[PDB]
Amino acid sequence: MYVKLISSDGHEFIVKREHALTSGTIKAMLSNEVNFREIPSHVLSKVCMYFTYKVRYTTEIPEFPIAPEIALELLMAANFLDC
Amino acid sequence: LRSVNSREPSQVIFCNRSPRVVLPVWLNFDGEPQPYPTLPPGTGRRIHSYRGHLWLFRDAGTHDGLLVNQELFVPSLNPIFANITLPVYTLKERCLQVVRSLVKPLDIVRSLYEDLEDHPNVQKDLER
Amino acid sequence: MDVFLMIRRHKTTIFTDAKESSTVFELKRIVEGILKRPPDEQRLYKDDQLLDDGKTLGECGFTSQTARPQAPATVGLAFRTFEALCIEPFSSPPELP
């Protein structure tokens, strides 16, 4: 079971329901597609990568990488969704 | 929160399983934090402490919070292994981390200006 | 070993995992559960290279250590006559302040 998270630029990110439910914001926006008007795809791919990273590691944990150019936007995205 | 002055020695290895320079922090008998010398990432250090003492560890440049055997490490009776790992930070904090580290103390909401300025702090976490 | 993949085509991107032992054809079965298209109407790529249904993801270079949770390998998806491989790039970030 999956959900579709669509970014601001049309890109359609399909991820497992349980991964998306980590975000409490998305659980509301599902209660199943979610449209993100302020989140472009280069930010929302990272969010999806974070879901997987978070679900797998919650051994030794690796650093979650964040490029500098996407850092601010991703911060706003993370701030809004609370993830 | 204070080390229990047991005087029962306790043999401990500070294992650094993180990509951060670890800063070990001993909570002396009055609860004040005492900073030990740092472990480069992936390096270890056999160290001499005592049953009932209180250790926590941080990134040593940013004071980000690390795990030890997954928050507070107390040497117990025997050596003992203190495995210092990255936590699974929130995505928000992780971005606060990256941003903090690329900008001296910008286009974001006012609530985020404060988040960026609410540095991780040892005295802070302790009350918690 | 689990490999973590983005399966991508046009402006579609599925995030999923598989075992390193599992097969291309078995991955096509996963796509079918999601995008509802049978494997025979699916082609799978690692870059430009058409992948064979019988080969394992590992053979095809999707290893637990390259295909990571926080950094997942990309598998190209083509639908069917068969279209060409098309993956729309993600948006490009602004300039650094």
Numbering used by the authors:
A (entry chain B): 17 to 47, 58 to 84, 88 to 112
B (entry chain C): 63 to 132, 134 to 141, 146 to 172, 178 to 200
C (entry chain A): 1 to 80, 84 to 100
List sentences quoted exactly from the publication behind this structure.
To determine the crystal structures of VBC in complexes with coumarin derivative compounds, we attempted co-crystallization and soaking with each of the 25 compounds (2–5 mM of 25 purchasable coumarin derivatives). Successful results were obtained using soaking for 7HC_1(DE22) and 7HC_5(D3), and co-crystallization for 7HC_2(D7). Three 7HC derivative-bound VBC structures were determined and refined at resolutions of 2.60, 2.46, and 3.00 Å. Similar to the previously reported VBC structures, four VBC complex molecules existed in the asymmetric unit of the crystal. The 7HC_1(DE22) molecule was modeled in three chains (B, H, and K), VBC−7HC_2(D7) was modeled in all four chains (B, E, H, and K), and 7HC_5(D3) was modeled in only one chain (the K chain). Our molecules bound to the previously reported “ELOC site”, to which some small molecules and cullin-2 (CUL2)-derived peptides can bind. The 2-oxo group of each 7HC derivative formed a polar interaction with the main-chain carbonyl group of Glu102, and the 7-hydroxy group also interacted with the side chain of Glu64. When we superimposed our three 7HC structures with the VBC−MB235 complex structures, the ligand-binding sites were identical. A structural comparison of ligand-free and ligand-bound ELOC showed that the hydrophobic pocket structure was nearly identical. These results show that ligand recognition is likely due to conformational selection, rather than an induced fit.
